[PDB]
Design a protein around this ligand. Structure first.
Ligand SMILES: CCCCCCCCCCCCCCCCCC(=O)OC[C@H](COP(=O)([O-])OCC(O)COP(=O)([O-])OC[C@@H](COC(=O)CCCCCCCCCCCCCCCCC)OC(=O)CCCCCCCCCCCCCCCCC)OC(=O)CCCCCCCCCCCCCCCCC
Ligand SMILES: CCCCCCCCCCCCCCCCCC(=O)OC[C@H](COP(=O)([O-])OC[C@H](O)COP(=O)([O-])OC[C@H](COC(=O)CCCCCCCCCCCCCCCCC)OC(=O)CCCCCCCCCCCCCCCCC)OC(=O)CCCCCCCCCCCCCCCCC
Ligand SMILES: CCCCCCCCCCCCCCCCCC(=O)OC[C@H](COP(=O)([O-])OCC[N+](C)(C)C)OC(=O)CCCCCCCCCCCCCCCCC
Ligand SMILES: CCCCCCCCCCCCCCCCCC(=O)OC[C@H](COP(=O)([O-])OCC[N+](C)(C)C)OC(=O)CCCCCCCCCCCCCCCCC
Ligand SMILES: CCCCCCCCCCCCCCCCCC(=O)OC[C@H](COP(=O)(O)OCCN)OC(=O)CCCCCCCCCCCCCCCCC
Ligand SMILES: CCCCCCCCCCCCCCCCCC(=O)OC[C@H](COP(=O)(O)OCCN)OC(=O)CCCCCCCCCCCCCCCCC
Ligand SMILES: CCCCCCCCCCCCCCCCCC(=O)OC[C@H](COP(=O)(O)OCCN)OC(=O)CCCCCCCCCCCCCCCCC
Ligand SMILES: C=C(C)[C@H]1Cc2c(ccc3c2O[C@@H]2COc4cc(OC)c(OC)cc4[C@@H]2C3=O)O1
Ligand SMILES: C=C(C)[C@H]1Cc2c(ccc3c2O[C@H]2COc4cc(OC)c(OC)cc4[C@@H]2C3=O)O1
Lengths: 105, 347, 171, 98, 96, 80, 314, 167
């Protein structure tokens, strides 16, 4: 049972720490505020059964914001091909990726 | 124990169960279980003897391990979902860990190995609290996460609980251990129908709480903790043997009693979902607990016993023990089957 | 998915405000006073577009108006400003409160030679309104179509047809 | 995912297997339980700090406080066992087998 | 005395925060050009590195949305030296 | 009411000072006139950026510049 | 360059602890109508040197220990914690300028009871273990009022920053709005360092009677490395000096003089009273300091709100 | 080598748990859990959770493990231990060799083998620690949480005084 006392009495006991998209102190956004907002606004009211199949793309974007598995996989691929071309000698790093250019601002 | 402090501690047990029932945030679920455990530990140590200290230590270790597994499940849910709603889980690993942790809090097999011991070490009123009130909160969490519960895990735990609760109580002469293996078997019966129809899970929970409350209240009214002291009841109060008769017949599932009501409905909700073999062997195992109930009332409740001379002193005194709700609970634990469609109020 | 579009390196070249943080902090009140409009057009475009690629040119206007803010200091009041940001620059926390007489010399020379009034306590934290010509973003999150909600309940509530219909219970 | 999370979970499972099947001092079981709590604190802290989810920063303190209160409760049970047998050997806790 | 001096200190804190607020648009503009600079440089170096790999789309977004995503730390400082990496990832934490 | 109070002030003056300071700390913010200004200063402290509004055409109470006379002011704080 | 700063922190700590023994013996001498050391150095100035050399060439026990490893780890932890307490102390600038230096010092001083506990473990004498348990319960008792008094004062500071506490007291000493906190704080720091009237390691045999002259000189000096620190911490906390940022040595001379007078106040307290019975200082903490400290913590919670004097966060 | 420092601490953290879950004694079990709390606290401090790191030092190590060592002193006056220790150490170092030779591993979940410096954020938070203001939110947004925690601690005091009495 979920006796929803908080909605029946109209009190906010623990809805505030529940999601990252809620009102934070000093309006601090979470890192995946936009993704979680998009997925929550997709899955709202349609039930969990329709949400698991009709909001898959928002949930994959949000889970990949959280864990960054695809981004780290792409960085692994680029850094590994770069290490292979450094070991073979077919590539050289530029002066702005070796630390010789005295950064912009 | 000071009665004011006893009231405060029982209200804290109730408050922890209420916090698990009403809260939307997983941390408050964990807090409610922590509050419930921390508050129930003195209820078990009410009489201050080494068996209660052993029972409370074993209960503490099992519920603490379960609470740590629950928090690890919540934390993996936070990894893979970035949020905290008490709803379905977003990882099968969190699903498995939370199902395991709630199975440890209920006392389901293979984590059943504390329920016959702890119930033996604590008094009858605290064993009543353990076997009735402490089932409400994890069944609420299982009620809310059932879109994520793995079916094979919950059915493995359920039928393992039913077999171990069946074949564990055949050997038992202690009444508290009979109630504890009955607890394990009934939690298997509640959790096997959970993913099919959770209203029948709630029906089994309420009928179980009524019958268990009836049995522990009769045990407190007669001050009997063993089979043989239960046999000495007819020469003191003959109606109490009749009531433990009809209530133990109801807990095994005889028709036309009310404890036949849930499990029949459970079979009725498992053949709709085209499961035939599973409720069949499930009720085959329930026939074994009904069968040792029928030995434990045929051989040792009906046919009248050798008594002791000091019992003829106890004829001159009536029961001044507060048998709170005992006739109501005895009527409800036996004569409720003609009102079987009352279950819709639990939908 | 798709290719993320990035502007070229020529689209990012602007003359930088190459001064230190104590230099920026020394002139910050007169900067917020005099460089109000392009800074607020930029921060309005920046909170509305939610995308820095759509906020380059307004940002260039910021870097256009900041430099003209400092040139107008350098043509007129270079020495009291230098004496002021040096004293700001000594402090490890960069206290305004340790530097009030140099602030007074800089504010005096700025009000005399440029007519600028320093903002008071509570002015630069105001929510102001910005009149731009750029349109309002109709979908700043690039959100797709939301799923249609489930059908709500309608119709008057009738009794159950012959009760519970549970095996033989006629009610 | 993150690689430090694997080490924190492996620490949790090490202390979980240390709790479960040893049959030793009771204090060693409480130490394994509080190692489980320590790894939960570290893991909750790294997740909440990683996601910049500000309102859950008070969550691990809660995870500390309750569980440390829990730890206090466990020690008192141990002390009652330490007032009964003279040791905290958990094989003295076998009265309730029969 | 602590009443008068803490009221004075709150006024001084508001003055410091308003100096921060007045500087924030210039810092925001420089930060935007900073991150787009680093992403464009990483894009060109990816285009000159990731040609041997078949089936590779240079600058391919891992997100199904087309919304601007704030660049991760390893996205910006992923192809630079370990000194700048260590500075940008633990400088404030390790600062004194 | 003064016999028990003098008795506890002669026997337990530590606890009398404790309960008196605790009672003052409880009841005195409900009687102080400066408790409003604590709230007012803690909301006047700009931790975030004052994000500007798009001028729709009709917002007279919103200024167009920080030095404009409309908007919230802090003269109550500069005077006190 | 930073290593030179670390060494000019920690080597003068050990020298100041060495000459604190001379100051203790001299000031206790003249208060007891006699002299302290004046033979070994001119005016006794070579007495700590001769004493440290004498201890370092005595034979150690190396007894039958329950743990050899914790017998080694107790002086190492004692000296390491006694030296790391000084690193956020702003005088006027700290070695490590951290945002949470107050909470850092509170946590590291809470870690100091393991030296007492492991020194009671390492001796096989069960009575030394009893005295160690009494010392640990004393120290963890007074850490409670340290934490709550320190919290009540930092409600007037605005942050956990130790260098902000100089800015806090630019007009008035913080002993004027918080002298009951200051006097309970001072007696509680006196009870932290096992210092008379709260010492229970000379009479009814302490926890460190197993140690003889190899580790003992280290333990002792780590113990006095806490004492000066606590007084310096009290000097930062209630007697904040004038800081001119263009002449920092004005602050350094001012806080140095105040910290010397406060350490001499420790010496002048221990030469003036008998000791507590053990349950009498437990009565002092749990029944006299703790209700007042809770009451004044309520007062310093509600007081900046009711005076509109909430301090700045930064 | 300095870029992986969090990772390096995490390895010690795992080692520290195998240091005490082997359980030679509650004495050395406590010592291993204190060293483990220190290194996991270093993990927490290296992500910017300075207040939560000082809560590990003040409350876990300085508050609670003191009470564990105290009770170990007062109440509690090989082959299995060393074998379980070296078994867990061999398991962990083979995991380190796998994840450093592969930069990808799967035991239960899929785990990257690069350092976790990549997964951070590139922004600033102004004049506050976000973690500090989130813990400050316990008194403004966390009312029900404060109520249930204070009631649990009051009940905890009452419960300890009940079961330690023995009457
Ligand atoms: C809704 C759910 C309600 C559940 C039951 C609530 C009450 C019981 C729980 C609390 C409790 O123990 O109270 C004492 C309890 C007595 O329990 P007991 O000690 O076991 O009774 C044994 C003897 O009766 C003891 O006798 P006595 O010598 O002390 O004095 C006689 C006593 C004296 O009575 C009074 O003094 C009462 C008048 C004053 C009341 C207080 C005023 C202030 O009268 C009675 O006890 C008469 C029987 C009362 C009814 C008990 C059962 C109630 C109904 C339970 C639900 C049944 C559901 C069936 C569903 C079937 C389909 C699924 O109840 C009362 O004294 C009053 C009951 C009032 C019922 C109100 C029903 C409507 C609620 C809306
Ligand atoms: C203008 C406004 C005012 C107008 C006023 C007009 C009325 C004035 C008179 C006022 C009194 C009215 C009485 C109630 C209405 C009539 C009830 C009735 O006859 O139901 C027929 C009902 C079905 O017959 P029907 O032809 O379909 O319906 C005819 C009517 O239209 C019946 O209506 P229906 O078609 O709507 O039936 C609905 C449905 C019809 O039922 C069904 O659809 C099937 C489901 C029935 C339940 C099956 C459960 C089987 C497993 C459990 C067995 C338990 C052990 C057996 C009993 C052992 C002792 C307790 O009922 C149920 O499902 C509810 C459960 C059955 C309750 C029956 C009433 C009991 C009241 C007295 C209790 C005393 C014990 C009675 C027997 C208890 C066992 C039932 O008969 C049975 O189920 C067999 C049991 C006997 C009926 C009870 C007779 C009541 C009076 C008994 C007096 C003698 C007492 C002796 C001492 C105590 C016993 C030791
Ligand atoms: C930091 C700079 C230095 C600080 C000052 C310290 C330097 C001087 C030190 C002198 C030597 C001390 C050696 C150790 C002594 C330990 C024993 C001792 O003193 O025990 C403490 C004693 C303990 O009591 P006791 O031991 O004397 O008595 C026995 C206890 N009873 C009575 C219960 C049986 O007193 C205290 O606890 C007082 C602590 C400080 C109280 C502060 C009160 C504030 C006043 C508020 C207002 C009150 C007026 C009424 C309300 C008004 C409302 C507007
Ligand atoms: C004894 C109970 C003492 C505290 C009672 C509530 C005090 C209060 O003002 O809470 C306001 C707070 C917060 O309300 P608020 O008025 O600050 O709301 C403003 C909105 N926020 C918080 C986002 C800025 O709590 C509630 O209103 C609801 C939660 C607690 C409700 C009371 C539970 C009592 C349980 C007793 C057992
Ligand atoms: C969807 C779920 C939502 C929630 C639904 C509601 C769930 C209800 C669960 C009920 C659990 C009750 C547990 C026991 C009562 C709690 C307090 C208690 O223990 O009272 C017993 C009390 C102890 O007194 P003491 O002095 O310690 O006794 C020792 C003997 N000298 O006194 C005695 O020992 C006196 C002896 C008689 C006691 C009988 C108590 C019966 C209580 C159960 C009533 C039936 C259940 C309620 C109805 C069904 C609800 C599902
Ligand atoms: C409402 C305000 C806020 C209240 C909550 C906050 C309180 C802050 C302080 C916390 C104190 C915690 C511990 C308090 C325990 C109180 C009970 C007590 O101590 O009773 C026992 C005592 C007799 O002492 P004994 O038992 O012998 O102990 C050994 C010492 N001889 O008997 C006594 O000492 C008698 C104690 C009762 C009389 C005290 C009266 C003080 C009046 C001061 C002025 C009015 C203050 C306003 C509030 C009313 C307070 C009653
Ligand atoms: C038996 C074993 C051996 C026993 C003897 C030796 C150990 C005991 C004595 C040493 C104790 C070490 C304590 C180290 C951590 C202390 C807490 C801390 O670092 O706080 C300071 C600070 C927080 O302030 P903040 O200003 O926010 O940080 C800068 C951000 N602008 O944070 C910072 O400045 C962060 C700086 C980077 C992270 C620092 C991590 C330090 C290393 C981890 C702990 C190592 C010790 C492990 C053992 C502890 C004791 C068991
Ligand atoms: C750290 C250095 C340089 C040396 C000097 C020194 C030690 C070690 C221990 C001690 C010490 O100096 C003094 C010596 O004399 C007394 C006499 C005392 O009482 C007569 C007394 O009471 C607490 C304490 C003491 C100090 C004490 O223990 O190493
Ligand atoms: C000892 C226990 C647990 C049970 C088993 C048992 C009894 C009491 C009585 C009897 C009994 O065994 C049964 C066996 O088979 C039938 C079958 C019957 O009908 C199918 C039938 O009808 C009355 C009667 C009987 C026996 C009978 O009298 O208590």
């Amino acid at each position: 049972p979920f006796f929803d006392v908080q909605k029946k009495l109209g009190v906010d006991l623990d809805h505030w720490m529940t999601i990252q998209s809620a009102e934070q102190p000093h309006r601090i956004p979470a890192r995946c505020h936009a993704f979680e907002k998009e997925w929550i606004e997709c899955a709202h009211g349609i039930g969990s059964i329709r949400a698991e199949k009709e909001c898959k793309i928002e949930f994959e974007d949000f889970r990949e914001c959280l864990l960054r598995q695809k981004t780290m996989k792409r960085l692994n691929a680029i850094k590994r091909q770069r290490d292979k071309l450094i070991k073979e000698g077919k590539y050289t790093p530029p002066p702005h990726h070796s630390g010789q250019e005295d950064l912009r601002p | 124990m000071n009665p004011i402090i006893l009231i405060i501690i029982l209200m804290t047990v109730m408050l922890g169960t209420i916090i698990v029932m009403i809260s939307t945030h997983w941390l408050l679920i964990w807090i409610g279980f922590e509050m419930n455990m921390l508050a129930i530990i003195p209820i078990m140590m009410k009489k201050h003897n080494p068996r209660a200290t052993e029972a409370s230590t074993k209960y503490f270790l099992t519920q603490s391990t379960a609470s740590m597994l629950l928090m690890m499940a919540i934390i993996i849910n936070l990894m893979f979902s970035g949020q905290w709603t008490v709803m379905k889980l977003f990882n099968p690993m969190a699903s498995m860990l939370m199902t395991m942790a709630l199975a440890m809090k209920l006392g389901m097999a293979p984590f059943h190995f504390w329920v016959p011991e702890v119930t033996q070490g604590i008094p009858l009123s605290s064993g009543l609290i353990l076997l009735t009130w402490q089932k409400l909160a994890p069944m609420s969490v299982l009620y809310q996460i059932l879109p994520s519960i793995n079916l094979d895990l919950i059915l493995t735990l359920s039928i393992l609980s039913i077999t171990i609760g069946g074949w564990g109580g055949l050997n038992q002469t202690q009444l508290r251990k009979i109630m504890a293996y009955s607890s394990i078997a009934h939690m298997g019966w509640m959790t096997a129908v959970l993913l099919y129809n959770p209203t029948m899970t709630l029906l089994n929970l309420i009928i179980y709480i009524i019958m268990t409350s009836t049995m522990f209240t009769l045990f407190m009214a007669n001050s009997t903790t063993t089979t043989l002291s239960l046999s000495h009841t007819w020469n003191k109060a003959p109606i109490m043997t009749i009531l433990v008769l009809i209530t133990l017949l109801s807990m095994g599932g005889l028709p036309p009693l009310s404890g036949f009501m849930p499990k029949w409905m459970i079979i009725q909700e498992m053949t709709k979902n085209d499961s035939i073999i599973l409720p069949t062997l499930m009720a085959i195992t329930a026939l074994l607990n009904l069968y040792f109930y029928m030995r434990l009332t045929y051989s040792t409740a009906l046919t009248m016993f050798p008594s002791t001379n000091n019992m003829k002193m106890k004829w001159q005194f009536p029961t001044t023990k507060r048998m709170t709700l005992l006739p109501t609970m005895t009527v409800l634990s036996t004569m409720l089957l003609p009102l079987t469609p009352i279950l819709s109020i639990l939908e | 998915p798709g290719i993320v579009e990035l502007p070229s390196l020529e689209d990012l070249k602007v003359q930088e405000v190459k001064v230190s943080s104590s230099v920026l902090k020394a002139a910050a009140h007169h900067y917020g006073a005099q460089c109000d409009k392009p800074n607020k057009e930029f921060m309005l475009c920046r909170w509305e577009e939610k995308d820095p690629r759509r906020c380059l040119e307004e940002g260039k206007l910021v870097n256009q108006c900041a430099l003209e803010f400092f040139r107008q200091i350098k043509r007129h009041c270079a020495e009291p400003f230098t004496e002021y940001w040096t004293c700001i620059d000594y402090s490890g926390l960069q206290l305004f409160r340790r530097c009030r007489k140099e602030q007074a010399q800089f504010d005096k020379c700025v009000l005399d030679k440029l007519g600028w009034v320093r903002p008071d306590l509570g002015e630069l934290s105001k929510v102001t309104k910005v009149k731009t010509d750029r349109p309002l973003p109709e979908n700043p999150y690039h959100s797709r179509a939301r799923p249609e909600p489930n059908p709500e309940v309608e119709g008057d509530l009738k009794p159950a047809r012959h009760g519970s219909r549970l095996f033989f219970w006629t009610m | 995912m993150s690689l430090v999370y694997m080490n924190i979970m492996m620490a949790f499972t090490v202390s979980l297997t240390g709790l479960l099947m040893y049959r030793s001092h009771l204090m060693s079981s409480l130490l394994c339980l509080e190692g489980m709590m320590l790894s939960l604190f570290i893991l909750a802290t790294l997740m909440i700090l990683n996601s910049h989810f500000t309102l859950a920063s008070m969550m691990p303190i809660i995870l500390l406080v309750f569980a440390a209160c829990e730890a206090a409760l466990g020690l008192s049970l141990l002390v009652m066992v330490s007032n009964t047998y003279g040791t905290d050997y958990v094989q003295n806790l076998n009265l309730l087998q029969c | 005395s602590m009443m008068r001096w803490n009221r004075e200190r709150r006024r001084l804190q508001i003055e410091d925060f308003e100096a921060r607020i007045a500087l924030m648009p210039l810092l925001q503009a420089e930060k935007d050009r900073r991150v787009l600079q680093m992403l464009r440089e990483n894009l060109e170096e990816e285009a000159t590195i990731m040609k041997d790999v078949p089936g590779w789309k240079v600058g391919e977004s891992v997100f199904h949305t087309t919304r601007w995503v704030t660049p991760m730390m390893g996205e910006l400082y992923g192809l630079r030296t370990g000194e700048e990496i260590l500075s940008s990832t633990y400088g404030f934490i390790w600062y004194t | 009411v003064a016999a028990f109070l003098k008795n506890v002030w002669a026997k337990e003056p530590v606890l009398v000072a404790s309960f008196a300071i605790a009672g003052l700390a409880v009841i005195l913010p409900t009687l102080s006139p400066y408790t409003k200004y604590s709230l007012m200063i803690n909301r006047a402290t700009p931790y975030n950026y004052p994000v500007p509004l798009r001028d729709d055409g009709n917002m007279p109470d919103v200024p167009s510049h920080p030095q404009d006379p409309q908007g919230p002011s802090l003269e109550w704080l500069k005077r006190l | 360059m930073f290593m030179i700063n670390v060494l000019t922190l920690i080597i003068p700590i050990l020298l100041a602890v060495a000459f604190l023994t001379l100051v203790e013996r001299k000031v206790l001498g003249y208060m007891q109508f006699r002299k302290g050391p004046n033979v070994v150095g001119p005016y006794g100035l070579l007495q700590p040197i001769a004493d440290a050399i004498k201890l370092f060439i005595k034979e150690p026990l190396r007894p039958a220990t329950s743990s050899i490893s914790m017998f080694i780890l107790a002086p190492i932890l004692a000296l390491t914690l006694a030296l790391t307490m000084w690193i956020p102390l702003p005088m006027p600038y700290p070695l490590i300028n951290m945002n949470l230096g107050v909470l850092f010092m509170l946590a590291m001083s809470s870690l100091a009871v393991y030296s007492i506990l492991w020194s009671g473990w390492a001796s096989n004498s069960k009575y030394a273990l009893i005295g160690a348990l009494r010392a640990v319960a004393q120290t963890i008792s007074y850490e409670v009022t340290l934490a709550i008094i320190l919290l009540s004062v930092l409600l007037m500071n605005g942050s956990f920053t130790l260098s902000t506490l100089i800015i806090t007291q630019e007009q008035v000493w913080l002993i004027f709005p918080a002298w009951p906190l200051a006097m309970m704080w001072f007696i509680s720091t006196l009870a932290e360092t096992n210092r008379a009237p709260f010492d229970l390691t000379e009479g009814e045999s302490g926890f460190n009677v197993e140690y003889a002259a190899g580790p003992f000189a280290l333990f002792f000096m780590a113990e006095y490395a806490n004492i000066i620190m606590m007084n310096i911490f009290t000097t930062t906390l209630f007697l904040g000096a004038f800081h001119n940022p263009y002449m920092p040595e004005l602050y350094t001379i001012n806080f140095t003089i105040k910290s010397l007078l406060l350490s001499i106040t420790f010496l002048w307290i221990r030469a003036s009273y008998p000791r507590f019975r053990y349950d009498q200082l437990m009565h002092l903490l749990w029944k006299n300091f703790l209700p007042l400290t809770l009451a004044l913590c309520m007062w310093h919670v509600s007081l900046p709100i009711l005076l509109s004097s909430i301090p700045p966060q930064t | 080598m300095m870029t992986y420092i969090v990772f390096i601490l995490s390895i010690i953290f795992v080692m520290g748990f195998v240091g005490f879950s082997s359980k030679p004694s509650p004495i050395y079990g406590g010592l291993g859990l204190i060293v483990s709390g220190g290194v996991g606290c270093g993990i927490v401090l290296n992500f910017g959770g300075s207040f939560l790191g000082l809560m590990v030092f003040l409350i876990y190590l300085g508050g609670m493990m003191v009470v564990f060592g105290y009770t170990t002193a007062m109440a509690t006056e090989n082959k299995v231990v060393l074998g379980t220790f070296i078994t867990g150490l061999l398991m962990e170092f083979l995991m380190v060799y796998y994840v450093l030779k592969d930069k990808e591993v799967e035991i239960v979940f899929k785990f990257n083998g690069m350092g976790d410096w990549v997964i951070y954020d590139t922004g600033d938070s102004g004049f506050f620690s976000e973690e500090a203001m989130g813990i400050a939110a316990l008194y403004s947004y966390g009312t029900w949480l404060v109520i249930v925690t204070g009631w649990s601690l009051l009940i905890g005091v009452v419960v300890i005084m009940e079961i330690t009495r023995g009457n």
